């Protein structure tokens, strides 16, 4: 999987909270299922196939979490 050749998530930055620094992309068997934005150095709960997963982000938007087999959530910084 190569996040250079996946087009941008369709997003909306709420103007009353800070602008989240990361794009994310969710894949089942290396096929894109879903996408959006998230904060760096933070966390979010996401439905990934049948399971809720606590996803932690570091300051470079790398995403760690216990992903069910066949599924991954990958992250990268938005421009700046």
């Amino acid at each position: 999987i190569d996040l250079s050749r996946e087009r941008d998530p369709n997003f909306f930055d709420n103007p009353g909270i800070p602008v989240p620094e990361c794009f994310w992309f969710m894949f089942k068997n290396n096929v894109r299922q879903d996408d959006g934005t998230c904060y760096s150095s933070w966390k979010m709960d996401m439905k990934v196939g049948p399971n809720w997963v606590h996803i932690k982000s570091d300051d470079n938007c790398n995403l760690s979490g216990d992903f069910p087999p066949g599924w991954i959530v990958l992250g990268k910084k938005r421009p700046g």
Binding site: P9, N10, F11, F12, N14, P15, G16, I17, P18, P20, D34, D35, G36, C38, Y39, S41, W42, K43, M44, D45, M46, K47
Partner: protein, 74 residues
């Protein structure tokens, strides 16, 4: 306290009805149609019960699935 971000997938002019219904919920700051297919609602606010909102969506609009819960950072 911190603001919430909730993303809901909805079967969807159901889009207007869904947006109207979520936008009418107490503590909502914003609603946005997100995803390539505009089949997701992103809600930002405070004191939103996502279970209460999914129930209202299912009873008023159609199939609704909670995809994401997270807080605003600062």
């Amino acid at each position: 306290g911190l603001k919430q971000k909730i993303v809901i997938k909805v079967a969807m002019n159901c889009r207007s009805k869904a947006m109207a219904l979520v936008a009418s919920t107490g503590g909502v700051d914003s609603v946005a149609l997100v995803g390539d297919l505009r089949d997701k609602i992103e809600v930002v606010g405070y004191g939103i019960d996502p279970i209460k909102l999914i129930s209202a969506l299912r009873k008023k609009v159609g199939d609704a699935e909670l995809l994401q819960v997270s807080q605003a950072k600062k």
